[PDB]
Amino acid sequence: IRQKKARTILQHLSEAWRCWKANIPWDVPGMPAPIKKIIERYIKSKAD
Amino acid sequence: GNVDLNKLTEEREKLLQSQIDENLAQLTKNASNPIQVNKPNAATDA
Amino acid sequence: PFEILPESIELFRTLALISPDRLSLSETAQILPKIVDLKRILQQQEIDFIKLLPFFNEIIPLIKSNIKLMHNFLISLYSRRFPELSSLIPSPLQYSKVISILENENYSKNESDELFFHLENKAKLTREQILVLTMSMKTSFKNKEPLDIKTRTQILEANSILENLWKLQEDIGQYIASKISIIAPNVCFLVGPEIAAQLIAHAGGVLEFSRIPSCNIASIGKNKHLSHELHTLESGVRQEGYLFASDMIQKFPVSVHKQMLRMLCAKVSLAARVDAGQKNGDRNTVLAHKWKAELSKKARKLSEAPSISETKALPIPEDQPKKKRAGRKFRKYKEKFRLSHVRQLQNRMEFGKQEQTVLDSYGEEVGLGMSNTSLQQAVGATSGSRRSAGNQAKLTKVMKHRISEANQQADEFLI
Amino acid sequence: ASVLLPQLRTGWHVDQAIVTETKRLVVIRFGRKNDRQCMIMDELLSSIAERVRNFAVIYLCDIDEVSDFDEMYELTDPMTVMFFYHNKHMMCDFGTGNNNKLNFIVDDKQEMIDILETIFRGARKNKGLVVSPYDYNHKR
Amino acid sequence: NGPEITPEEATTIFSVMVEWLESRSFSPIPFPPLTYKNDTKILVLALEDLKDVYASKVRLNASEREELALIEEAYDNPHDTLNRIKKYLLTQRVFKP
Amino acid sequence: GNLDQAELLVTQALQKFPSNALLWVEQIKLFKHGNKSSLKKTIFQDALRRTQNDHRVLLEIGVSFYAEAQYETSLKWLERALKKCSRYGDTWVWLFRTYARLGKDTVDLYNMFDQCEPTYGPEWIAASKNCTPREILLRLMND
Amino acid sequence: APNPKAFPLADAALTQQILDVVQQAANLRQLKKGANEATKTLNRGISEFIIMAADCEPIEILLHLPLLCEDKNVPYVFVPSRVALGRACGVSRPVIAASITTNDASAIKTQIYAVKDKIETLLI
Amino acid sequence: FTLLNRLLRLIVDPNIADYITAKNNVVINFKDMSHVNKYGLIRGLKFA
C-alpha cells in the first residue's frame, strides 16, 4: 500500500515547509527518526 | 546535486519497520491554513 | 512552646486598628520580637505538632492583613516624599527593601552601588522595574533629607518589623509545603508541591482554597498589575500567577497555555475540594490522577491541529440565470450591492469637456463625472447626489454587538 | 507531482481517458519525465487538479515511453499539454500561435485554473477555439 | 536579554528630557475632559481622516465597509462615541490584534 | 469576639429586609475587619445596588477605605455621600478627618457647612445627646 | 441507586417542584448554574437556596457546597438527576450545582420561598 | 516601552501614556504567523 504512504509523506513534506514559512516548529510526534531527519534536511535546503 | 540526502535515505531504509510506516500520522495543517482560507474568502466573498 | 500561638493570634488581631499607628506602632513593635521569632524557632524544630494547622490556617490570613497594614503605614510615611513609589513597586516587602535602599545614603546621589543594591539586596527587582524606579526618582522623588530623623527612624522600624513578618510568612509557607502531601495530596498530584503550598498558604487552609471558586485561582500569586508594565503575551494567558508557572501548563506550547491554564484552575479547585472533603490519612489520590490524565489528553488534543481537508473544488461553471426576483424586502438587500443612480451618473463623463475632478489629498485622480449638472458644476456642489439611504454602510452583526457592549461599559463607568 | 496526479502507461490508455470523460474536461500533459519545464508544469497541475476536479481532470504522458501521439504536433515535441472534451481536441488561442497546445509554462495557479475554466466553458458551448483570458506572448 | 537600554543610560536620557521640560516650563497634556471645549471638532477631524481613504473608491470590501459604518456611527451618535473613546483611553489595556 | 455569628445574623436580616441600609452598613463594617479582605468590592457594589446608593452605605464604604488608608478614594466616597444627603452628620466628621490626614484644608468645608448636622447621623446624634453649638461639636468629634 | 452522602436528597414531587423553580429562575436570570458559581453565590450571600446533583460522580466535588450552606445557613438539597437539573437550568450538558439567587422584586419570589421552606423542612 | 512610557508621562496624563504603551504592545499577525510586540513601536497606530 505504498502509494498511499507516499501521498501522506508528500503532505508531511509540504506541511513542514509551511510551518517553517510561518515560523512555527515541526514537532510531529509519531514520525520515525530518520524520515524526520530527512524532512528537516530538505527544509534546510529549501531555506538556503 | 542530491548527494547530501543520500546518507539520510540510507539511514531511513536501515531503520524503519513496515509497522512504523503503516502508522505514520496523517499530518495536520500546523499553520491552521484551511480556517484562514475560509475566513479571508468569506471576508472577500466578492 | 506549643501553647503560645493563640496569644500570637490575639496580638496580631490587636494590630487590626488603622493608620495612624504610633502608640499603636509601639504596641506593634512590642508584638514583633515577642512573637515573630518564637514561631520561626518552633517551625525550625521538627516534630512539635501535626495539628498546628488549622491554627496556622487561622493565622496566615491575619498575618497577611498585618503585613498589608504595615505596607499601608509605610506608604503613608513615605508619600509626599516619593509618592509614585507605591505605584511603581507593588509588593510590600519589596517596597520596604526599596525604601531601605533609598534611605541608605553615602554615594546615593550619583551611584553607590545604587542600581546594584536593588538587584542584589532587593532581590526581586527586575530590569524593567528598576528602569521605572529610576525614572520615578528622576522626576518625583524629592531627596531633601527626611522630614525629620525621627520619621526616618520610624520608617526603619517599620521596615524591620515588616521584613520580619514577611520572613515568618515565608517560613510558614515552607512548613506547609513540607507537610502538603499529607494536607492536600490531590492538589499536589495535579500541580506540584511548592505550587500547592503557595496556593494553600494564600487561601488559608485547604477549606479556604476549596471555597475559592475556580476562576479566581488563576490570579492568585500574580504580580500586582501596574499599568506602565507591558502585559500582552503570545500565550494570551492574562493571569500569570503561581499555577501558570506549573509544569502541567508550562510543558505544553504557548498556543495552549490559556485554555490549559483555565483547565488547570478548575481541576486544581476540584482537587482542593476533594482534599477538604476527605478526613486525615485517607490520601485517596485517584480522582486527582484521573484529572491529570484528562488534562494531558486535553493538551494533546489542543496541540494536534486538524487533518488536511479534501481541497474543496470549484463548482462546474454552468451559467444559470434562475433568480429573476424583486420585492421591497429583496430590493433593499440588493440595493446595497447595485451601483446607485449617482454612481451611474458619475460613470458617465461628458464628452468634450475637461470633466470635473475632486482633488482628494491622498489621490487627486478622482473624477466625479456627470453626477454634477452642467450649471451646478459651473457654480457648486450637490446634496441631491447624496440621495440614498439603501446603501449607507451598516455594521456587521459582530461589530454591532461589540459596539453595544462598549456602550454598556461606558454606561457602567458613568454610574 | 508524481504521487498527486495520475499517470498514463500507453497510447491506448490515453485515448480511453480522452474518450471516457463525458462530463469533465481532460488536460493531458505530454512530457519527458526528467525535464525541468515538464516537471514545473506537473507541479502546477498538481495544485490545479484538486481545485478544478469537478470540472476538469489532469493526466500525464511520458512522451518517450508512449510515442503514439506524434500526430498531435508534427514532432515538435517540447513538454506540452493538451485539452480534450467529448473526444474533441480543444483549441486555446494565446498569443503564441500554437492554438493547439500550450507548449509553455504558466506560473499563476489561479491563472492556470482560469484558462482551464475558459476551455471547459468553450467545450460546453460546443466551441472548438477559445480565446484565453490571458495573453501570454512571452513564453514561446 | 532584557531591554537594551541599561539603567544608567535611561537615567541620563530621562534626565535630559525632564530638564528640557523644566526649562520650557510645560503644562502637561491633561486627559481629554468629560466635557472638552474642542472635543467635537477634534472628533470630526479624526473621522474625516479615517474616511479619507474611501472618498475615492467606488466599491468597498467588507473590512472597509465596516470601518465606514463605524465612522458613520461615530458621526451620528457623537456623544456615545466620545464616551466610548474616553473609556478606552482610561481602561482598555488590551486589544484586538 | 464572635464574628461568624454576627455575619450570620446580618445575612438573616438581609434575607428578611434586603433594602435596609443599616444592615448593609453593618455587613460592610464586618467585611472591613479583614476576615475575607476580599469579596469586598463586590459586596460593596451589591450593597449599593440594593440600597440605591444609600447615603449611609456610601459613608460606610468611605470609612472602610479610610481604615484601609487609601485616602483619595475615601474622600471621593465621602463627597458622594454628602451629595446624596448633606443634612446627615458623621459624614462631615469623616471628611474632616480625611482632610486632616491629607495636606488639604478646611475653609471650603466650613463655607459649605451652612447646612444642618444633628438632623440625622449616629455619632453626631450621640454627641448632641451628650450641648448647643455645632463647630465645637465637630471639633470634639475630630478629637 | 443514589449516593448516601448526597443528603438531603429530595423526594420526587419535591424534586420536580425544585426543578420548576430553577427553570423559572433561569428564565428570569435569577439562577446561577455550576459548582463554582454556586460557591461564588454562597460567598456573596445571594444564594437563596442550593440545588446539587446526587448523581454527581465523583460526588466529592459537590460535598463542600453543603458544608458552605451549613456555615452560611442557606438551605440545600440534592436532586437525583444531573441531566434533569442541567435541562432545567437550560443547558444540554449535565450540571451538578445550581443556586437560585435572591432578588426581592422577582415575580417568582413567592414560589422560590415555598421551595426554600420545603428544603428547610427536609434538613433536620 | 518602559522608557517611552515614563517619558510620555512627562507630557500627557499618565492614563493616555499607559494606553499608548498597551497599544504598541499588541499581537501582530500575518498570514498564519504571530508575534507580540514586547518592544519596538508600531508605526501605523494613528498617534504613533
UniProtKB/Swiss-Prot annotation, chain C:
<feature type="coiled-coil region">
    <location>
        <begin position="46"/>
        <end position="80"/>
    </location>
</feature>
<keyword id="KW-0508">mRNA splicing</keyword>
<keyword id="KW-0539">Nucleus</keyword>
<keyword id="KW-0687">Ribonucleoprotein</keyword>
<feature type="coiled-coil region">
    <location>
        <begin position="149"/>
        <end position="183"/>
    </location>
</feature>
<dbReference type="GO" id="GO:0097526">
    <property type="term" value="C:spliceosomal tri-snRNP complex"/>
</dbReference>
<keyword id="KW-0747">Spliceosome</keyword>
<dbReference type="GO" id="GO:0005739">
    <property type="term" value="C:mitochondrion"/>
</dbReference>
<feature type="site" description="Interaction with U4 snRNA">
    <location>
        <position position="215"/>
    </location>
</feature>
<feature type="domain" description="Nop">
    <location>
        <begin position="183"/>
        <end position="304"/>
    </location>
</feature>
<comment type="subunit">
    <text>Component of the U4/U6-U5 tri-snRNP complex composed of the U4, U6 and U5 snRNAs and at least PRP3, PRP4, PRP6, PRP8, PRP18, PRP31, PRP38, SNU13, SNU23, SNU66, SNU114, SPP381, SMB1, SMD1, SMD2, SMD3, SMX2, SMX3, LSM2, LSM3, LSM4, LSM5, LSM6, LSM7, LSM8, BRR2 and DIB1.</text>
</comment>
<comment type="similarity">
    <text>Belongs to the PRP31 family.</text>
</comment>
Curated annotation (Swiss-Prot), chain E:
<protein>
    <recommendedName>
        <fullName>Pre-mRNA-splicing factor 8</fullName>
    </recommendedName>
</protein>
<comment type="function">
    <text>Functions as a scaffold that mediates the ordered assembly of spliceosomal proteins and snRNAs. Required for association of BRR2 with the spliceosomal U5 snRNP, and the subsequent assembly of the U4/U6-U5 tri-snRNP complex. Functions as a scaffold that positions spliceosomal U2, U5 and U6 snRNAs at splice sites on pre-mRNA substrates, so that splicing can occur. Interacts with both the 5' and the 3' splice site, as well as the branch region. Has a role in branch site-3' splice site selection. Associates with the branch site-3' splice 3'-exon region. Also has a role in cell cycle.</text>
</comment>
<comment type="subunit">
    <text>Component of the U4/U6-U5 tri-snRNP complex composed of the U4, U6 and U5 snRNAs and at least PRP3, PRP4, PRP6, PRP8, PRP18, PRP31, PRP38, SNU13, SNU23, SNU66, SNU114, SPP381, SMB1, SMD1, SMD2, SMD3, SMX2, SMX3, LSM2, LSM3, LSM4, LSM5, LSM6, LSM7, LSM8, BRR2 and DIB1.</text>
</comment>
Curated annotation (Swiss-Prot), chain F:
<comment type="function">
    <text>Participates in pre-mRNA splicing. Part of the U4/U5/U6 tri-snRNP complex, one of the building blocks of the spliceosome.</text>
</comment>
<protein>
    <recommendedName>
        <fullName>Pre-mRNA-splicing factor 6</fullName>
    </recommendedName>
</protein>
<feature type="repeat" description="HAT 12">
    <location>
        <begin position="1"/>
        <end position="33"/>
    </location>
</feature>
<feature type="repeat" description="HAT 13">
    <location>
        <begin position="69"/>
        <end position="101"/>
    </location>
</feature>
<comment type="subunit">
    <text>Component of the U4/U6-U5 tri-snRNP complex composed of the U4, U6 and U5 snRNAs and at least PRP3, PRP4, PRP6, PRP8, PRP18, PRP31, PRP38, SNU13, SNU23, SNU66, SNU114, SPP381, SMB1, SMD1, SMD2, SMD3, SMX2, SMX3, LSM2, LSM3, LSM4, LSM5, LSM6, LSM7, LSM8, BRR2 and DIB1.</text>
</comment>
Swiss-Prot record, chain G:
<dbReference type="GO" id="GO:0000452">
    <property type="term" value="P:snoRNA guided rRNA 2'-O-methylation"/>
</dbReference>
<comment type="similarity">
    <text>Belongs to the eukaryotic ribosomal protein eL8 family.</text>
</comment>
<keyword id="KW-0747">Spliceosome</keyword>
<dbReference type="InterPro" id="IPR002415">
    <property type="entry name" value="H/ACA_rnp_Nhp2-like"/>
</dbReference>
<dbReference type="GO" id="GO:0030621">
    <property type="term" value="F:U4 snRNA binding"/>
</dbReference>
<dbReference type="Pfam" id="PF01248">
    <property type="entry name" value="Ribosomal_L7Ae"/>
</dbReference>
<dbReference type="InterPro" id="IPR050257">
    <property type="entry name" value="eL8/uL1-like"/>
</dbReference>
<dbReference type="GO" id="GO:0071001">
    <property type="term" value="C:U4/U6 snRNP"/>
</dbReference>
<dbReference type="InterPro" id="IPR018492">
    <property type="entry name" value="Ribosomal_eL8/Nhp2"/>
</dbReference>
<dbReference type="GO" id="GO:0032040">
    <property type="term" value="C:small-subunit processome"/>
</dbReference>
<keyword id="KW-0539">Nucleus</keyword>
<dbReference type="GO" id="GO:0005681">
    <property type="term" value="C:spliceosomal complex"/>
</dbReference>
